[PDB]
Structures are given as structure tokens and as C-alpha cells.
Amino acid sequence: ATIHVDGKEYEVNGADNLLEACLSLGLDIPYFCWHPALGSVGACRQCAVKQYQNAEDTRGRLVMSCMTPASDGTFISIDDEEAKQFRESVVEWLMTNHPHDCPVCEEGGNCHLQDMTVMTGHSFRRYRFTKRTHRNQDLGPFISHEMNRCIACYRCVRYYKDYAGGTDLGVYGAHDNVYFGRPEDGTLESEFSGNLVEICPTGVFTDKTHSERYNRKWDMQFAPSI
Amino acid sequence: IIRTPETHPLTWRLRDDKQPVWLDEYRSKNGYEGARKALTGLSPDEIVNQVKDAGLKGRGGAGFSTGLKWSLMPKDESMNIRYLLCNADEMEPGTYKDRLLMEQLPHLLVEGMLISAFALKAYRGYIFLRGEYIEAAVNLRRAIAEATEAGLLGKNIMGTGFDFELFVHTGAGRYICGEETALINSLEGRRANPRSKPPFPATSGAWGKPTCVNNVETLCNVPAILANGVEWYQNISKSKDAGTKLMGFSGRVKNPGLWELPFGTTAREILEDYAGGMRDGLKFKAWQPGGAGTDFLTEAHLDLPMEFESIGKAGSRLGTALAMAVDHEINMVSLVRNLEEFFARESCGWCTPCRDGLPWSVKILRALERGEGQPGDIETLEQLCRFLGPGKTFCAHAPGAVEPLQSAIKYFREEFEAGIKQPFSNTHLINGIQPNLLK
Amino acid sequence: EPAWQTRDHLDDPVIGELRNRFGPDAFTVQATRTGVPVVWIKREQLLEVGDFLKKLPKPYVMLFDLHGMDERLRTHREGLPAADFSVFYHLISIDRNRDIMLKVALAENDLHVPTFTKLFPNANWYERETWDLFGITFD
Amino acid sequence: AFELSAAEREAIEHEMHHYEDPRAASIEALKIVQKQRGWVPDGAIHAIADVLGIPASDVEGVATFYSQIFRQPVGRHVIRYCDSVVCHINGYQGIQAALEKKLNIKPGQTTFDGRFTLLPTCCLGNCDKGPNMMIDEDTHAHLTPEAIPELLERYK
Amino acid sequence: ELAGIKDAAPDATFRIRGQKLAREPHRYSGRTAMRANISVHEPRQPQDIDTMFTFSMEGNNQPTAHRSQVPFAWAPGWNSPQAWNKFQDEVGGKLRFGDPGVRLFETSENGLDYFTSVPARFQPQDGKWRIAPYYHLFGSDELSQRAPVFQSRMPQPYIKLNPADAAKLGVNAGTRVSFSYDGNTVTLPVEIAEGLTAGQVGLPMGMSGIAPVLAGAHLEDLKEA
Amino acid sequence: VACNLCAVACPVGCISLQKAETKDGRWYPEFFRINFSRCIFCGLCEEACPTTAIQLTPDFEMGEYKRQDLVYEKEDLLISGPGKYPEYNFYRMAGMAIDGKDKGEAENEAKPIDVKSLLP
């Protein structure tokens, strides 16, 4: 399929949505709730781009690139002013209740939420009211739980239930009091629960085994191994 | 007020002593005859076509065409498992019309659901009813039992050979359950998060099956169409919206209530001739046409016909046509604070802008109510209204949430500016660090 | 309009003089945030371009800079000639109060440029430095 | 220490007969347990999950999603007063102040003897007769602040 | 037959435009202080003569490099594990310039014949108990069980028994019975397994003292002790 | 809080530390060493500290006889006072529960509302 991103013509696969098509081409669109393995649900509303149906169109319409197919003849703008302000506003809304926790967070320097806050260019706080807090659960010896850092992107529950087939992780709560975890305390008995520390874009689910002797990602010496 | 069957196709069979009408009395005064004609003389396709040519729009508030919605179910015969759902939630503030429809006329809803289930070839029907309507639930169950025993529900209905089973699913008290896809999710025993469309419920709805969700008042309009004809239905009022709508004014008026009026009647006729106007010593300041999720309108908008396109052209929505009047004694900042508190606490939490921006508007309005507003708060509210509009959020709870806020800022800005008393201060002084003083 | 914007610098009269002298298919113009017209020229025409800039009515009389650059690791080179290495010559005309930056593209094996010392005598140490740190030979 | 009684079990099974998925009876199963015991305790989530076959995480999510499925212990009678826009116009604040003066609690708590639990609720669909209040199964309309003490004595 | 392991990875002379592949990110810190307690003279970084990687950040880790062995994902603006998006030709698809590792053998042109050695039906012999293996993701590996964090995750050693066999032996759930294999009278507590077939004892392979070679073996003198 | 921002912000790389955790859950440096024979006294670590723990004091008399003794450890760096910033505590802003500070007890933080609460 042929799409037009910011006036530039691109050849994409028409069976993919606009987010993975644009991320494949190297175009940076912010996103939280979409994962390549899980699918598209349109939750976080972070992947907004301005869509036009014609080459001669001025108004457009803010759509979700993860929920919009990459059909032939779509003219989308990523760095349009309205789309950038909406993505910055989504980051700001996620930043209203987020705790001042980055130094004492195991996901600091490896955080998707940090990267997307920096990418949208939001660095000034106008919210002056209180931030909601949450209690934490004991998830066993492997996964450490810190519920205050959640952005309600539903990646954890989607992976753990619709992909791994687990039965003890879920969404609870309400309007802005959404909780993600177990109905009680106990060990996550899924054999693939360790992928939650990389599925979660925030520092809610963290590696407790790494948290015992913790260093940042830049301090790590890596190797490819089996 | 006198209600002939011609101009009052819904409320003419209401009793003066406000008791429910049961099967013998309902069938005495021309009951279940439209269902008889539908099930003995017409194919489902021509019934759908009759509803389409009747111009019956959706009475839930959006005004979508009912026949066009019915025509969108798949035409192949491989899927014989089909569902018809009656959205008896009616959780919107200012809305009390479905309560009147099902508390005193349950057999009308049963007959309309039977007609619409035969038209859609829907093998099962569920009345998704809110938990607060208790006597409505009792009346609906008793009417269902009476119709089941008297050869109208169950197996081989009226000798045709059509099987239809009707159930009442009593809800558990959440406002978002009235959204049709969230209604489907709640019917499947899940959390009532709405779903993205496409796919629409007509192709894959409840349990992956073709499913049609309709309001109570639409299914109460359908038996009058199938009984008294289509041309009679198009000749009720000389307006682009065919049929009669349950309209009415509520809130500090002389006679608040609910009356069946044809489309095109102006809101002033409802306020003075039916509602009686404002009460003693009270003046008129504003009004809301379609419940809590509609734009506020002023006194100059009162001489406006109550159609979808007429109210829509004047920067509002017809909604459920149950208008609510705001007097001069009501502070509009407090009213919008109450509205936003309801809309924020009845969020489902699926998508970011509603979930994490409606409480921001709530806290801004709490600050403005107490006089602790700071500069930039009204601009923040305007930006929230712009960034919570249609298409920005996953469902339509949040655009309807933010419509009263932008309407109040547009029409009554001087009340919002009066709550800004203290200067803007987000930071506190850290001793040893000179702050950056931006200009 | 802010002063940090990426300017293509096609309004400079030196670009028009170079088009009218060497033709419209002799060089590429790179849009940068340098504030200086960046002209990618061929290696064979480098001395001719330098002589033309030295013989202008308000000539570029000063060689401000001369150095190499390893472009083997440069991922974003859209609108640039293909190069493993490059040599840039920054020149100043005080009379026009203008600058120009001539860039010459070199492959990894053919790392030789004609010397610039005859046109500008201060090119000697710059070319020695470019040979020392980048391995580019100056014939 | 929780165990479903017999009548709750046949009620849940009979509601499972109504749907083609046993998951679809979860809301009514929670409502049946709440009707029997006043609220839904911790073991009821796992017992309903066992009797339906769905995981307990989904039952907990359904129970915590809906406001009328009480996951905390309540009093003998649940007072539910409407705080929506039309009753705000009709003056629900006086009714709430009278309830706070009588029961001597905040909205959301239960009295010390466990008689009344006071809760705000959304629109009751009776806005033409506002302000309204839903005690356990009875709706009360045209409320006045002096009718609260004469109206709270019919629920012992 | 092991000829494909040469092409599994390129040799130590492989370079990306002359430089090696970095094992650590470019912002690796503490270089002049991580060894200063031993000596204030910082030694040379260790040299990797075996592979194409280097024990330093002086190397290549670009998302557009022509290699298949990626030590870690990092891109400018992408510090999360979402940085793997830049290292793939399409997101969620193959790795760019192919995935590492090659297959040793291809599918043969012809296949085998039918195995005619059909085994007999399992008859529970009196006295002898067939050992049914019960593998655990935490516990049945040789080296993973030596990790101290797996001690709080590994299940307790429980021998699984049929209700009928435990009723015959007089054992209920919880109590300890002793069995002897190769002169080792070891005692395990009993867990009742309904799904296990009669005549078998369920044993956890890879635990302390119970080798995976015990699967399918016999078990004499199973008495309550 | 052993967040390692000073070590990576150091252009010279003369800061080394390791994070450890107490029983309550608060973070601290298990060790903290600075190679002062290698430090250039540029103040980037103090600039990058989000807790104002590391500071550059007005002191210059650090002459030494052996540069092995110029590797200062945590016992040589940790002082008994706030230094140049007298009334800043990072843990009053953090949302992580430690001793003497439960959930919601930080600045601009609301009380934790349970999902089992009866309020809508």
C-alpha cells in the first residue's frame, strides 16, 4: 500500500495499521498500549496523528495510528501542531498522578514512559493538585510491584491473560482507581510472568532478582548469549 | 390534556391513576395487533423496510435510523443465532422517560421487542435494565410471564413457527453500561468497557453473534408503526423527524413532568404550556436540551424547535429531549462542578483523556467554587474541552462530559472568572536554589 | 522566523555565480543550520572553484578552516553525495561579510585530494593535520 | 471460611441456563450473594469463580467495577441519595446535610450499630420528582430536610 | 554433521566499518573509579580475541549495522525494550539482516519406516511401583535449582500417589513414606494425585536426590515410615 | 538514594557506587567512592543530583602524598548535615513507601483509595 506521511510517499503493507507501518519506516510516533505481539486496543490514546482523505485537505481528523489501517491513499501528519499538542496533553494527563519516583525506580533509564515524556517534549507541570496513590501487593520472589507508577495502559493484563493464558492477573477498580494485579497476595503462578517487567512500560512490575543488586542500563555490560 | 391514539401513539393507553396496564386491558384497547400483523402477514425483510420508510430514528439520543441499523445485520443464513437487546439503562441525569414507559406499559415493550426480534430473526432477546428500576423490573417480569402463558412468547408464536425467548438482565449500577458495546460487554459478564467500531455489533455483537441494541422508546414506537401503518407515522408532524418524542422540562419549574409531543414543537411551548414556566420568584437563566451530556443554551434559544438538526445547528444536541432548566439562583460553576464530578466518577477507566483529564477539570472547578482559582485554569478547561472532543477518546462518554463545560464557559464566562482570586503557584521555595523566573 | 532554521542558502549571489560559471549540474547544495552556504563539489573541480572564489569582484580572500570528516558511520545523509570520507574548506569574504563551505567527497580507497596550499598558503598545517588524523593524502 | 449455600447454588445454575456462556452469569451471581449476605466477601469471589469456571481475577474485576456490588461490609439498610444535576438544582445538599445530622456519619461509612450506611449515587431516573433517595428497595421523592427524621424510623 | 556451526556467527575478524561491536552502552560510567579500591592505576580493558565483540563501549551498536548478533537494544530517544523496533526490518517481524543461528540439518528427501514395536498395556505389578516423572519449571534443571532465588519458588519434594494406592497402603495426604532405590531408603511426604494412574508413584525429577534417570524405573519397599 | 545519576553525568567517570535497600524499602549507597586524583571539580554531579545529596563544598586543601589515598570512600564523603541545601528531602516528594512515610503521606499526594470501597 501507498501512504503519505508529512508529504513524503511511503510503500507500506496494507494489512498493518498505521503505527507499525510508520515505526517500521523509522518514523517516531509515541505509543504505550500497543505491542507488536499483543495487538491494538486503542487505550492510551498516545499514538494520535492527523489524517486527511485527500491530498488537498486542511482540517483533517485526529486518529489513532494503532487503530487505523495503512490503506492506500491515506495522508497522515505526525508532526502537525494539533497532533503534537494532543500527544503532549496525553503525556501530561499521565503525568498528573505519576509519583516523583524516578531516582528510586528500577525502570529509570530503561523506562518507556520516560522516553515518551521526553519525545513529546513535555517538561513543564501546570497540575497543582494531589496525586492518587495505591497500595502494593506481594507477587512472589520474582516480580516486585509498585502500583503508583501505572499509567493504565492494560499491556500487563492483555499479555498475561490473552497471550500467556494466566488466570491470577486482572484489572480491578473504577474510573481512575484502576488496579492491576492479583485479587489477593501470592505468587504469580504463570510460567511466563517474568515478561511483565518488559511488557510494562513503567516501573510497576520490576525484576526483584535484579532489584536486589540493582544497576542502571547504561552501567550494564551486555552480551548476546543463549 | 387529552390523548387520542392518533397523535399520542405511546401514552394514550396510560391510566389516570398511574397503574401498570396488564395483558387483558392492553389487548382490549388494541394490543398485540401490530405484532399479529407482523407475524402473520409480513416477511422480516419487509418489516425492516417498513421501519426504514417510517423514518423512525433512534430514541436513545443519537438519532440514528432504526431501519438502516436493522438492515446492517449479515444477509447470509449461516448465522441463525441472533440477539436483540433493549437498552433499558437510562442512566443519564435528567432522563426519566424509560421509567414511565416500562413501569406502566411493559406489554408495549414486550410487543415491540417481539416485532423487532421477528424482523431481525433474533432468536433471543435481553432487556438490559438498570438495577434501580425495581417496580419496572417486577412489571417487566410479570408482563413477560403473561405473554409467555398466553401464546405470545416461547415456541411457535401465533402459529407462525417462530421461537423467541425474552429475558430481563438487571444491571449492577454503572453509567457506562448504557453504551451499546459496553452493554454487550456487561451482558457477557465482563467489565463494561466499550468496544471500538468497526466492527459494529450488527455483524459481531454479543458473544460474536449478530446483535442489535435499541432503546426502550424505539421499541415502543415500532408497534404503532406496525399496527397503524407507515404513512400514518410519516403524517404525525410536518417535520423532518417522523414520530413523537417523549419531551419535558425538569428542575425548579411549576409542573415538571413528561409529555409525548411531536417533533418540531419549540422548547418554549414545553416550558410554559406544559411545564408551566419557572416557579414563584424565580427567573430563567439557562437550559439543557437532552440531559446532562448536552450543551447549555440560553433564553434566546428557547424559541427553537426540538429537532436534531435544529438544536444541532445552534451548538447543542437534542439528546433525549428531556430538558432541564437552570434558574438565576443556581451558580453555574457549582452546577458544572457537579456535572463533571458525575462524569469523572462514572468513567470506565479504559482510555487516558477521560480517565485522567475529567478529574483535572473536577479539581479546577472545585478550586473555582471555593474561590481558590489560579490564572490559566479557564484556559486549561478550554484545552480540556478541545482535547476531549469526538474522536479523541475511545467512546463518546467524554465529549458529552465536556459539552456542558465549554457551553458554560462560552455563555457564562464571568462566573468562572470570578472564582480566580489567588495568583498562580505550582512550586514552593527550595532554600539554596534560585528559581527560574519565566516571563 | 528564527535564526536557527535550516536554510538552503540559494539566495546567496555566490551560489548564482557558481551556477553561471560551472553550470547547474556541477555541485550540490546542502541545507544546514550553519548559516553558511554548503556546496558539495567534485574533487576534479576543487582548484577551479577555489580560483573562481579567489578571483571574484569581492573575493573570498581567507581560508578559515580546512579539515576532514569520517562519514562511514553517518546514518542520516539524505540529500548528500555518497562518501566514506569528506574534506571541508571554510572560506571567508570580508568584503561581502560572507562565508562559504566547500565539501569534497572521497571513497575509502581513493583518499587523495589536490593540495590547497598554492591558493592559500595557510593550508599547509591544515592538510598535515588532516593527513595525520584522517589519513587523507594531499597530492 | 466461605461456602455457597444450596439456594444460591441453584440460583446461579438457573441463571447460567439463561446464557450460552457461564461467564455471563457473573453479575447476577454476585448480586445473589449480595442479596443473601448483604455484601460480597472475599471467599465469595473464588466460590463464584469455581461455580462458573471463570478465573477469580475476572470475578474480582467485575465486583470492583460495578458500584452496587459491595465488596466492603455495609449496614442493615443502604441509604443511597442522588447527587446528580437535577437534584442539585432541586437541593440535594439540604437532604444530605439532614442525613449527616441524623446519622452522624460521612457519606460512605456505616453507623456504629450497623443500622444505616449512607452512600451517594448517580441519577435515579426520577428527576421530575427530585430530590430522590433510594433506601434498600424503596425510592423516596419530593424530599424535604424535615422529612428525613420522620422517614428514617420505618427501617429498624 | 556439525559443519553448520561455522556459520552460526562470524569470526573474530568481523568488523562493522572497521570497528568492533560494543558490549556496553556509550554512557558506561565509573571507568576510572570501578577498580580504584584495588589500584588507582586503571588497567587496560580486557581484550576479546575469541569474538568480534569488545569489552568496552569503543565499538558499534547501531540499529542499522550489518550484523545479526545484537548485544542489547538502544536507540536515541528509545531507552526501553521498545528500542528493538529500530533493530528489525519490520516491527514484530524478523531481525534486520537476518536472525542469528543457522539450522544444522535440512529435511530429508525420504523418511523412516513405521516402528512396529508396539508396547504392551501397563499392568500394575504388586510390590513394584513404576516411577512417573513430574517435571517442574523451577526445580528440574541442574543449574537453575542452585540459584538462591529459586529456593522460595521450588515446590517441596512430594511423592504423588493414587487415592486407591494410598488407601491400600494406609497413607493419607501429608504423612511421610520411605522407599529404597539402590540402597537409599529416602523418605518423602505424600501428595494425593487423582489423575495419576494406579500402580505408579509420582516423583519430582531433578530435585535433591531424585535424578531424572529415575523416570520409568521401579520402586521396591514403599512403606509408611 | 544510589540512583547513579552522578556517576553517568560525570564526564570523567570517577564516581562508583552500588545501590542497596534497607528493610523498610529505602534506597542507599552500599558504597560510594570518588577518585579525586581523577576528578576535575566541574560540579556536574551536584548539578545532576535529584536529591541534593552530593555537593561541592568550599574546600581546596586536598593535597596528598600517595594518589591511592586520593580515592575517597563513603566514610570520607558522608557528612553529618544538610550542607548547602538545608531543608530539602527527596523522600517527602517520592511516592515510594519507606519508614515513617506510608502511601499518600508525601507532598501533593492523596490517600490511597481501595478498589473495594463503597464510594462510586
Ligand SMILES: NC(=O)C1=CN([C@@H]2O[C@H](COP(=O)(O)OP(=O)(O)OC[C@H]3O[C@@H](n4cnc5c(N)ncnc54)[C@H](O)[C@@H]3O)[C@@H](O)[C@H]2O)C=CC1
Ligand atoms: N441514557 C441515555 O439515553 C444516554 C444517551 N446518550 C446518547 O448517546 C449518544 C452517543 O451514542 P454512541 O453509541 O456512543 O454514538 P453513535 O452515534 O456512534 O451510535 C449510536 C447508534 O448509531 C449506530 N450507528 C452509528 N453509525 C453507524 C454505522 N456507521 N453503522 C452502524 N451503526 C451505526 C450505532 O450502532 C448505535 O446504535 C450521545 O450523543 C447521546 O445523545 C448518551 C448518554 C446517556
Ligand SMILES: Cc1cc2nc3c(=O)[nH]c(=O)nc-3n(C[C@H](O)[C@H](O)[C@H](O)COP(=O)(O)O)c2cc1C
Ligand atoms: C456514555 C454513553 C451512555 C449511554 N447510555 C445509554 C443508555 O443508558 N440508554 C440508551 O438507550 N442509550 C445509551 N447510550 C447510547 C447507545 O450508545 C446507543 O445509542 C443505544 O444503545 C441504542 O441507541 P438507538 O436508540 O439509536 O437504537 C449511551 C451512549 C454513551 C456514549
Ligand code: SF4
Ligand atoms: S515508571 Fe518511569 S516515569 Fe515512572 S517513576 Fe519509574 S522511571 Fe520514572
Ligand code: SF4
Ligand atoms: S501495570 Fe504497567 S502494563 Fe499494566 S496497565 Fe499499568 S503501566 Fe500498563
Ligand code: SF4
Ligand atoms: S471516554 Fe474512555 S475512559 Fe471514558 S468511559 Fe469512554 S472508553 Fe471509558
Ligand code: SF4
Ligand atoms: S565535579 Fe568531579 S566527580 Fe563531579 S561530575 Fe565533575 S569530574 Fe565528576
Ligand code: SF4
Ligand atoms: S549522589 Fe545524588 S545523583 Fe548520585 S546516586 Fe546519590 S542521589 Fe543519585
Ligand code: FES
Ligand atoms: S498505541 Fe494507539 S492508543 Fe495506545
Ligand code: FES
Ligand atoms: S438527577 Fe436525581 S433522580 Fe435524576
